[PDB]
Design an enzyme around this catalytic site. Sequence first.
Site, short mmCIF file in Angstrom:
data_model
loop_
_atom_site.label_atom_id
_atom_site.label_comp_id
_atom_site.label_asym_id
_atom_site.label_seq_id
_atom_site.Cartn_x
_atom_site.Cartn_y
_atom_site.Cartn_z
N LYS B 112 -1.13 -33.22 59.43
CA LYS B 112 -1.00 -32.63 60.77
C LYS B 112 0.43 -32.18 61.05
O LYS B 112 0.63 -31.21 61.80
CB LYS B 112 -1.49 -33.62 61.83
CG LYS B 112 -3.00 -33.91 61.71
CD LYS B 112 -3.67 -33.97 63.07
CE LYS B 112 -4.98 -34.76 63.00
NZ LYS B 112 -6.09 -33.90 63.43
N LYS B 194 -11.00 -30.50 54.37
CA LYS B 194 -12.17 -30.93 55.11
C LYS B 194 -12.43 -29.99 56.28
O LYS B 194 -11.57 -29.24 56.72
CB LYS B 194 -12.01 -32.38 55.57
CG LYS B 194 -11.14 -32.61 56.81
CD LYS B 194 -11.34 -34.04 57.30
CE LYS B 194 -10.68 -34.30 58.66
NZ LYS B 194 -11.36 -33.49 59.71
N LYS B 197 -12.79 -29.82 63.51
CA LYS B 197 -13.03 -29.31 64.87
C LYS B 197 -11.97 -28.36 65.37
O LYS B 197 -12.26 -27.38 66.06
CB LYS B 197 -13.05 -30.44 65.89
CG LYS B 197 -14.39 -30.98 66.23
CD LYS B 197 -14.26 -32.46 66.45
CE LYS B 197 -13.13 -32.83 67.35
NZ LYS B 197 -13.43 -34.20 67.81
N1 LIG Z 1 -15.21 -32.87 57.66
C1 LIG Z 1 -15.63 -34.09 58.05
N2 LIG Z 1 -16.62 -34.69 57.35
C2 LIG Z 1 -17.05 -35.90 57.74
N3 LIG Z 1 -16.61 -36.65 58.75
C3 LIG Z 1 -15.64 -36.03 59.43
C4 LIG Z 1 -15.10 -34.79 59.15
N4 LIG Z 1 -14.07 -34.48 60.03
C5 LIG Z 1 -14.04 -35.52 60.84
N5 LIG Z 1 -14.94 -36.50 60.53
C6 LIG Z 1 -15.12 -37.76 61.23
O1 LIG Z 1 -15.41 -37.47 62.59
C7 LIG Z 1 -14.91 -38.54 63.43
C8 LIG Z 1 -14.09 -37.96 64.58
O2 LIG Z 1 -12.91 -37.31 64.06
P1 LIG Z 1 -12.07 -36.30 64.93
O3 LIG Z 1 -12.36 -36.48 66.38
O4 LIG Z 1 -10.61 -36.40 64.52
O5 LIG Z 1 -12.56 -34.85 64.46
P2 LIG Z 1 -11.95 -33.66 63.60
O6 LIG Z 1 -12.96 -32.63 63.28
O7 LIG Z 1 -11.20 -34.30 62.43
O8 LIG Z 1 -10.85 -33.08 64.51
P3 LIG Z 1 -9.28 -32.85 64.50
O9 LIG Z 1 -9.07 -31.72 63.50
O10 LIG Z 1 -8.82 -32.56 65.89
O11 LIG Z 1 -8.72 -34.15 63.91
C9 LIG Z 1 -14.16 -39.50 62.51
O12 LIG Z 1 -14.99 -40.63 62.22
C10 LIG Z 1 -13.88 -38.65 61.27
O13 LIG Z 1 -13.74 -39.47 60.12
MG LIG Z 2 -9.47 -35.52 62.54
#
Ligand SMILES: Nc1ncnc2c1ncn2[C@@H]1O[C@H](COP(=O)(O)OP(=O)(O)OP(=O)(O)O)[C@@H](O)[C@H]1O
Ligand SMILES: [Mg+2]
Lengths: 331, 334
Positions: B112, B194, B197
């Site tokens: 990040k 990965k 969001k």
């Molecule tokens: N690509 C992915 N595949 C599987 N699980 C995921 C993935 N991205 C996030 N997660 C899971 O989703 C949950 C929430 O994570 P989070 O709210 O940080 O979402 P994010 O998509 O990583 O967003 P950001 O990029 O803002 O970190 C956590 O348990 C994380 O491990």
């Molecule tokens: Mg995340």
Amino acid sequence: KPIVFSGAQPSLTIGNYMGALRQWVNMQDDYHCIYCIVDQHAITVRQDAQKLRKATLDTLALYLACGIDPEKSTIFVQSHVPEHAQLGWALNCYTYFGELSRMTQFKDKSARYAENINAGLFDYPVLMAADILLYQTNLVPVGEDQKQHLELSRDIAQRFNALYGEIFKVPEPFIPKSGARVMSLLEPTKKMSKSDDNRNNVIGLLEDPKSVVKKIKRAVTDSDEPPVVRYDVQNKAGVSNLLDILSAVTGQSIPELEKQFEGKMYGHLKGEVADAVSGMLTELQERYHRFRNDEAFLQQVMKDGAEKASAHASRTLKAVYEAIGFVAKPH
Amino acid sequence: TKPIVFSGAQPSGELTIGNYMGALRQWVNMQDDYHCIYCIVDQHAITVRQDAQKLRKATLDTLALYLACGIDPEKSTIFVQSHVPEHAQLGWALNCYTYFGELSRMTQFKDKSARYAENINAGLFDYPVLMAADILLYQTNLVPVGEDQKQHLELSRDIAQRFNALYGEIFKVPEPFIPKSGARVMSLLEPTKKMSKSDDNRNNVIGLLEDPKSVVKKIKRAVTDSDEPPVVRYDVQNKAGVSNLLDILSAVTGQSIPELEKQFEGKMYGHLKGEVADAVSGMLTELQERYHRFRNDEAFLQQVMKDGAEKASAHASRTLKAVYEAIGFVAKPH
Ligand SMILES: Nc1ncnc2c1ncn2[C@@H]1O[C@H](COP(=O)(O)OP(=O)(O)OP(=O)(O)O)[C@@H](O)[C@H]1O
Ligand SMILES: [Mg+2]
Ligand SMILES: Nc1ncnc2c1ncn2[C@@H]1O[C@H](COP(=O)(O)OP(=O)(O)OP(=O)(O)O)[C@@H](O)[C@H]1O
Ligand SMILES: C[C@H]1c2c[nH]c3cccc(c23)S[C@H]1C(=O)O
Ligand SMILES: C[C@H]1c2c[nH]c3cccc(c23)S[C@H]1C(=O)O
Ligand SMILES: [Mg+2]
């Protein structure tokens, strides 16, 4: 009436008393003074749990003994106001990592720092900023050791205000100093410091007469022959320091004291200083033990002070949370 | 009392199929078997700068999407992190039992920092500590997360154990629960990173609210490899994009990779993409049908938040009072 914030570590010297604190005790009617016993800062250094609790109460009774009036000033324990940690977390998100590593003197990219220093020691400047900014503070009295931390609080306040509007007051240092700089007893060119490893340099407000008199009797003087009790900081640092300590205790001017000690030896000067200091501490310690032994009174002070503190702190925190974009907790 | 499950997600964008297969689907499925507590962690979200109006909307988008997915406020405690002061309070205290090296070596902090070099802030570095505070406040036994949070959970295990070795049986030591497929769903146009969001490039992600026409279009453009003949085989190193499609399909349908490889013997990537898009869209039909009713029901959203903060605060305060006693703080008078 300007708002003034001091943090008080729960772990004081006559230099602290006759310098900052005594003067502030007499300005509780001129400013809205807030005194915060920072037990969340204290746990950045690991200590026995029962000693920390006791020392929090020691610090409270000491400040009451020094004359802090809880009817005029707000005095309270940091952990009793949740908003301190709440704002601390939020302000972390507006503090550059680079700012906090500059505070460690850039020693944080090494392996020694990584394996031994805890994150509290690294992050506590943001919590100090939260302490100050929660109360719309206008004035923060700090010694030279805290100027960098105060500057960070002003930078964070301005950076947040620039994004969200005037949510915080930008604090200022308290510029005027009072008293004299009390110098350490065995190195009269170094300021007396609460931190000194050589405890013979320092007089604590809670040392008994007997130990205080010993340290003052051993204070370093000069080799002038014959001995002359005369004020000269450059050439007579130890004798001048003793005169400055005596004048600060008694209010007698230095010319007056110079007349008193005409034709007298350095031992008679030390005796007088020891008596004057020893007398001041007895009054202080007598008041201290009355406050400290009244657990219920101390409890009532902390409850009242944290209720006062909470009312102001929650107002600021609600405005921070509203500006950030948080959904307000339903009530 | 049942064992306790805690997990959180940031209000930083529309949840993706990655969030659903990595975390959210397990959240739903655990609600009867355990005592589940789920959190919209807005204090974590502000470690990455957002517009105030955006963050406020995103908090309620996240809440309504939890509900649409089947998080049941009569079975689970649902709340917003910032409504419960104990999280920040325990977060600060745990800073003092966390070593600087443990945070500086974190993969998320490095990733990040690169993405937001203009905002490398202390919250971003301190992220794992506040997360440990979120988990340990509730005597949590199980934390359902995707693979990317495994390292952060290990710090949570260490912090609890380190604290307990000084002060006694204060915290439960939490255990990660990461699924066997879909733990790390990868990005459609960059299959070596990965799905996230918060990705600016929306063609990398599939939001849970995207319609079948949007799903097919994004899956049809997903990066594959140059193999001739194309071969449907799982190989992350040489075939990252195709392997990501196989993982997604395995996660939707529950078929094993070797069963999927047999099913696709002699077939081409266009057929694999046809199957992935249909399986994904089928997985989203129910939650998409209810999301707007949840999202436009302000009173229901308020009630869920009010009730969740009150339950969460009751339980959190008991842990924090035990913590403040152990550490040596003077308790706040009644
Ligand atoms: N690509 C992915 N595949 C599987 N699980 C995921 C993935 N991205 C996030 N997660 C899971 O989703 C949950 C929430 O994570 P989070 O709210 O940080 O979402 P994010 O998509 O990583 O967003 P950001 O990029 O803002 O970190 C956590 O348990 C994380 O491990
Ligand atoms: Mg995340
Ligand atoms: N020996 C001293 N003479 C005069 N003023 C002093 C002396 N020691 C402290 N003060 C003043 O008391 C206030 C408390 O500051 P601070 O606690 O940093 O002092 P200190 O006891 O020297 O600290 P440290 O031991 O950590 O260096 C400041 O305004 C400082 O200038
Ligand atoms: C006690 C510390 C502290 C915590 N919060 C604040 C706020 C203002 C001034 C100070 C502090 S002074 C500082 C010190 O180390 O003296
Ligand atoms: C949303 C974040 C978070 C805050 N508190 C918790 C508790 C459990 C799991 C997670 C979190 S998952 C983590 C992430 O960044 O993925
Ligand atoms: Mg100083």
